[PDB]
Design a protein around this nucleic acid. Structure first.
Lengths: 127, 542, 150, 330, 84
DNA sequence: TATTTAAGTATTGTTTGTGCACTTGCCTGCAGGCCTTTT
DNA sequence: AAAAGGCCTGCAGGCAAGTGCACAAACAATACTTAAATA
């Protein structure tokens, strides 16, 4: 009975890398004009583009008891290699350009299991 | 001139003297040779481990490659840096084709580059033909042997999925030749779930006929990482020990990396040994032969030890004697590194526990919490008292150890790159020495004063109002008196005679500091043909 | 003991009277009081920060009398024990070693050691020959060697 | 709030429209290019020259420590406030080249890379490496990594890349080209970053191959070499004087009447289309009415009389520097 | 008021089958170019719909609900959900 | 008969272009609330 | 005093001034294969 009820389908992330995807999901699905009232369905559409300094502000607030050293930028550069966060350019990208913005590139189901492993409430920010 | 051109080409020991400049010259020469003994012995075992990683990787791949569908092999955690060597079986020619995301711009260039390497490899072993699928079909009529193409897609996460999907369907038509077998190899660096949503339904079901998983990351099960940490402890057995703060900083840095954490561990282990042979003057007492070389300066340093102060404090509560007490107290091997090797070889052989790391196991033995780590597996319950060991706090143990406390290892490999720029610009009194002497002590520099007003501002700053704020801070009587102190330049005295001299000098220094801030990423301009508003992109503290 | 009390409502004339007992001028006394006003919260015991700040500036100001007479260091410790109603000598050493780390990177602490840069120039430059805060200072070991001889 | 994450959300409030200012570059004094360089070169060699020279002598003692890191395979990456051009050319030549050549027994050649120049291609840099060591560029470095592994550890080429934050170096095509060369134990990599987003360029796969070592050396350099590559002085005060000089005598009289009429009430909106024809009725300058298009298409090419019909024209130029233009044309 | 409710992992195959059958067109998509000049420039440029996942791709219906009610008989059980 | 590179096809790259998105000014549209009558 | 008749004024009806910013194509001139002169 297990061969007809289903199709049988077809056939280790870092701590800093896990928290960086959480702050990137907020900056890409929420307006930055009301950010001074929480830290101080939009998920059904395309995510919005944000800035680098806007991402580190929320990432530092949601991080448990940290300045922005080279370890934070190292996990952020690796987050773009795995195609987990999109930008404005595909080939020959310039990270030092001030006009190139960053945006999230993961669905809601993927970002839900990541926040559940670090015991972070990610569903209350959009309720 | 080289200063106006673009780019031009221009075609006994580094160990300084210690002991406050009173160290002899015979001690600096032996310190360079003593460091090379531990540097060559550590790299000899590391190079053997690196060569052993590719040895087991080439055997595991070949065991799954040869033992009407595609032979998909997913290499989870591979940075496309492994050289795959195929076998040389008779009556069958194997060709390994490596595809890179840079050399694959479209579908037409994917088949043309794959056919060039196939025709070049088959001709070098034993008439011009087209570079298309006709060569694969006519491979038996032009050579006489079978075909076994092994495609190795380098960096799958860096290539476009719209082009890779068309290449798999194009290669599916080669199954009706009864002599052509294609085996695809993917080097996934993220997850198996991210590469499935970017493909069509006809591609997932086709590759699922014979797909296998082969996870080989930099720390797959913490197996290769245990051999690197063990090699660093064998060369210091009985000579140098580790502290509780050094193992914590190692685990905090290796946890951030994933795809390349093995090379990062060797960088921290080699940097700690370099600072010990350059700062600590007690490195000459490691060898049992260079022990008699003692003086009045060496005895005054070992007396300022925190562990030695406790031993002399309890003796009174209950220079000849101090020399014999220091030499006859270093012959002990100190079982602090050999005990960790016995525990690591007892769980992997007897208990068959391979999902353990030697870095975290060594940190529990130093603080005395080994029972709080072995109980997480629920397997060595009866062997709790057998592997019980307590660290012995020996005297003068910090003079021959690798401990990080003053921020030396932090401000070297993993420093605060963003915080150092904002701290040195705002707090300029910590870098510049508080010793044209009147202007240097009454007027702030252009680089330091511009960062002060830049932080105390909103997101939208106006350049017309920022220049007035910077000009009001600089004195008028000290600026005009400093520019007139150069009587050799006749053009500097003519500009100062004009009434608008103070308004022109401040504008020149302001334009030089504004463009210097844009090259570093502090400010941001709006339009291109405007140059009227500036934004903020760097916040001090975050 | 006064160091075991948590959350003590200290006034403005308490730190002034405690600083006058150790013979301190008005210049170094106002800097200790101003340090408590900015750090009113984020603390466990207010007596641990006041005692650690007064004794830290005593060795810097009275540095000329400690080198000539070793009994000055042994006497300045027993005086603070009677005011804090404590009898353990380890609590005084543990209090002056925690406040010194928080005041090692300020502006008023730098000018006090100059009037009464060589070490801060190696930490920012990333030098491997900087003074590590692990071993005991050379000026501190000479005092303990003379205290056990009397 | 100013510091920490609380300072980011507090300094970005919604500014009202009436609270904003309307100050432009009209009230600021105008400067030329000749007086801009004379003052810059004077302040960079006399202002704080003693503290800058004393601080440079302190960092000079770290020269043997920098050479000790390059011999173990650790690449150097300097950073801080200001430029590090004078600190790299004085160390990688007057200290690194004589010490290496005298420890492995001519000097060691050093390839200086100009990262600040936007015209730094990836095919011209690799041409000098092959000629001194003896995508086809990436495949050539991969063949030299395994070949130099069996060779003994001996530094033969020093790579002194200047400014690791320019537009040419930040490209992904050039970054991976230099990281693969840094794995070779026989090539020394000495770079210098200036942007605040330096670690964002390299990831985990690039940091292991680079093996960079940070060294903060904030010398507060004014950066005079890299400042001559951008338009620092950046509608043409001095450029408009050369246009009227090359024109005829009658062409200068047409622009003189337009300036006097526009600068009469700076609140006059400007000179109307038919208003310019009324000036010709009192001064025989042009021919008739159809000849107005022959002179209107020439003034708009040199950016001197912009049109803004709500024909009322108005050039975006204040009357502060426009008064001096009447004396030159007179 | 029993139809087997399929999981989200099974509708992906049905979603991709309706796209190939000309039913779901991409939003603001040109499609087939006129001449061979515009066909080469469009292949070298990576569209935004290929980088985003399949569950966030904006699509368009090739047939409105008013036309589906006319080509569906009354015997089908899905006729009550075509009026809105 | 094969090294010499000019010039060739094939192809890269960033440039401005404009279709289209978004904010927030404004009374005025409108409805919860106040006043009046009454035991 | 309080529910029952009229009508006063807070909240926000509504969209257009204008900047914003993702879209597409020929754009500039990359790197590369080609053919032909040469010893």
């Amino acid at each position: 009975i297990k061969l007809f009820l289903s199709t049988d389908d077809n056939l280790d992330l870092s701590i800093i890398s896990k928290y960086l995807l959480i702050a990137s999901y907020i900056c890409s699905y929420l307006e930055p004009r009301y950010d001074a009232s929480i830290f101080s369905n939009p998920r059904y559409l395309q995510p919005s583009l944000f800035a680098i300094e806007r991402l580190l502000a929320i990432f530092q607030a949601i991080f448990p008891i940290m300045k922005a050293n080279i370890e934070v930028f190292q996990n952020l550069s690796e987050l773009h290699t795995l195609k987990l966060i999109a930008t404005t350019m595909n080939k020959n990208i310039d990270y030092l350009s001030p006009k190139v913005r960053w945006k999230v590139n993961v669905p809601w189901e993927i970002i839900k299991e990541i926040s559940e492993s670090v015991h972070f409430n990610i569903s209350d920010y959009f309720s | 001139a080289d200063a106006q051109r673009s780019h031009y080409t221009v075609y006994h020991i580094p160990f300084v003297k210690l002991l406050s400049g009173k160290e002899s010259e015979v001690n600096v020469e032996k310190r360079w040779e003593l460091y090379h003994q531990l540097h060559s012995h550590f790299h000899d075992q590391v190079d053997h481990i690196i060569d052993n990683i590719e040895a087991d990787l080439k055997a595991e791949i070949s065991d799954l490659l040869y033992s009407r569908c595609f032979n998909t092999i997913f290499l989870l955690g591979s940075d496309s840096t492994t050289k795959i060597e195929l076998k040389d079986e008779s009556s069958r020619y194997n060709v390994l084709i490596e595809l890179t995301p840079k050399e694959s711009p479209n579908v037409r260039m994917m088949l043309r580059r794959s056919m060039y390497k196939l025709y070049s490899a088959a001709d070098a072993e034993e008439n011009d033909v087209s570079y298309d699928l006709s060569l694969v079909e006519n491979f038996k009529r032009l050579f006489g042997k079978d075909l076994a193409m092994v495609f190795n897609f380098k960096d799958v996460d860096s290539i476009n999925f719209n082009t890779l999907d068309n290449f798999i369907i194009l290669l599916k038509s080669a199954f009706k030749y009864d002599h052509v077998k294609i085996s695809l190899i993917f080097n996934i660096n993220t997850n198996l779930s991210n590469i499935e949503k970017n493909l069509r339904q006809s591609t997932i079901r086709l590759l699922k006929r014979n797909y296998h998983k082969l996870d080989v990351s930099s720390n797959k099960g913490f197996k290769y990482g245990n051999q690197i940490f063990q090699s660093f402890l064998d060369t210091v057995d009985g000579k140098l020990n580790l502290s509780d703060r050094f193992v914590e900083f190692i685990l905090s840095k290796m946890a951030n990396n994933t795809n390349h954490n093995l090379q990062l561990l060797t960088k921290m282990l080699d940097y700690s040994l370099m600072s010990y042979f350059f700062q600590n003057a007690f490195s000459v007492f490691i060898d049992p032969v260079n022990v008699d070389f003692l003086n009045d300066d060496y005895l005054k340093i070992l007396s300022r030890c925190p562990t030695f102060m406790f031993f002399v404090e309890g003796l009174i509560k209950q220079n000849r004697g101090l020399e014999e007490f220091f030499v006859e107290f270093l012959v002990r091997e100190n079982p602090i590194n050999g005990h960790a090797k016995f525990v690591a070889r007892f769980l992997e052989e007897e208990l068959n526990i391979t999902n353990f790391n030697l870095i975290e196991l060594y940190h529990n033995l130093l603080i005395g919490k080994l029972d709080s780590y072995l109980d997480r597996w629920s397997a060595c319950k009866e062997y709790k008292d057998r592997l019980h060991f307590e660290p012995i706090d020996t005297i003068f143990q910090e003079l021959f150890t690798l401990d990080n406390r003053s921020g030396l290892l932090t401000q070297s490999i993993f420093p605060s790159y963003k915080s150092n720029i904002e701290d040195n610009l705002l707090s300029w009194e910590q870098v510049l020495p508080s010793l044209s002497g009147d202007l240097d002590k009454i007027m702030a520099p252009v680089l330091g004063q511009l960062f002060k007003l830049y932080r105390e501002a909103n997101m939208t700053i106006n350049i017309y109002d920022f220049y007035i704020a910077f000009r009001e801070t600089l004195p008028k009587e000290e600026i005009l008196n400093f520019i007139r102190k150069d009587p050799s330049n006749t053009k500097l005295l003519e500009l100062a005679e004009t009434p608008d001299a103070f308004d022109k000098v401040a504008l020149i220094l302001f334009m030089q500091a504004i463009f210097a801030f844009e090259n570093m990423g502090l400010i941001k301009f709006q339009s291109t043909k405007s140059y009227d508003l500036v934004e903020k992109c760097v916040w001090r503290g975050i | 003991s006064l160091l075991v009390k948590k959350y003590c409502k200290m006034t403005t004339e308490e730190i002034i009277r405690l600083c006058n007992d150790f013979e301190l001028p008005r210049e170094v006394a106002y800097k200790i009081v101003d340090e408590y006003n900015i750090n009113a919260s984020r603390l466990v015991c207010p007596w641990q920060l006041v005692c650690g700040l007064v004794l830290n500036c005593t060795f810097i100001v009275f540095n000329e009398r400690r080198r000539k007479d070793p009994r000055i260091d042994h006497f300045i410790v027993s005086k603070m024990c009677s005011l804090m109603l404590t009898s353990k000598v380890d609590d005084v050493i543990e209090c002056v070693k925690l406040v010194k780390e928080l005041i090692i990177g300020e502006k008023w602490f730098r000018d006090l050691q100059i009037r009464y840069y060589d070490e801060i120039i190696f930490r920012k430059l990333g030098s491997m020959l900087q003074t590590t805060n692990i071993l005991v200072t050379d000026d501190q070991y000479n005092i303990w060697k003379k205290r056990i001889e009397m | 709030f100013l510091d920490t994450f609380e300072g980011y959300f507090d300094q970005r409030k919604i500014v009202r429209t009436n609270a904003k200012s309307r100050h432009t570059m009209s009230m600021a004094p105008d400067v030329t290019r000749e007086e801009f360089s004379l003052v810059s070169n004077f302040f960079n060699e006399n202002f704080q020259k003693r503290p800058r020279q004393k601080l440079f002598e302190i960092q000079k003692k770290m020269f043997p420590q920098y050479w000790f890191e390059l011999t173990q395979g650790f690449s150097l990456l300097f950073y801080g406030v200001g430029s590090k051009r004078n600190f790299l050319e004085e160390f990688a030549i007057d200290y690194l080249s004589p010490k290496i050549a005298y420890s492995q027994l001519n000097s060691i050649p050093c390839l200086i890379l100009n990262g600040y120049n936007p015209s730094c291609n990836y095919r011209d840099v690799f041409k000098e490496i092959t000629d001194l060591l003896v995508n086809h560029v990436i495949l050539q470095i991969q063949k030299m990594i395994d070949f130099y592994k069996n060779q003994p550890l001996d530094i033969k080429l020093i790579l002194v890349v200047h400014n690791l934050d320019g537009p040419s170096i930040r490209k992904n095509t050039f970054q991976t080209m230099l990281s693969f060369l840094s794995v070779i134990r026989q090539i020394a990599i000495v770079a210098s970053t200036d942007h605040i987003y330096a670690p964002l360029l390299w990831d985990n796969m690039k940091a292991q191959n680079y093996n960079f070592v940070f060294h903060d050396i904030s010398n507060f350099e004014p950066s005079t070499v890299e400042s001559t590559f951008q338009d620092v002085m950046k509608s043409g005060a001095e450029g408009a004087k050369y246009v009227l000089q090359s024109l005829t005598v009658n062409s200068k009289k047409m622009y003189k009447l337009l300036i006097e009429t526009q600068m009469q009430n700076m609140q006059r909106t400007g000179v109307e289309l038919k208003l310019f024809n009324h000036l010709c009725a009192a001064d025989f300058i042009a021919s008739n009415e159809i000849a107005l298009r022959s002179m209107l298409r020439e003034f708009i090419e040199h950016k001197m009389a912009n049109i803004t019909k709500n024909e009322i024209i108005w050039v975006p130029y204040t009357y502060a520097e426009l008064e001096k233009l009447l004396k030159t044309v007179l | 008021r029993t139809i087997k409710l399929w999981l989200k992992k099974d509708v992906k195959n049905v979603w991709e089958n309706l796209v190939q059958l000309d039913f779901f067109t991409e939003k603001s998509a040109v499609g087939l170019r006129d001449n061979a000049t515009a066909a080469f420039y469009a292949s070298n440029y990576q569209f935004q719909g290929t980088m985003i996942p399949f569950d966030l791709r904006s699509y368009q219906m090739q047939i409105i609900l008013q036309e589906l009610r006319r080509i569906i008989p009354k015997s089908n059980m899905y006729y009550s959900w075509t009026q809105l």
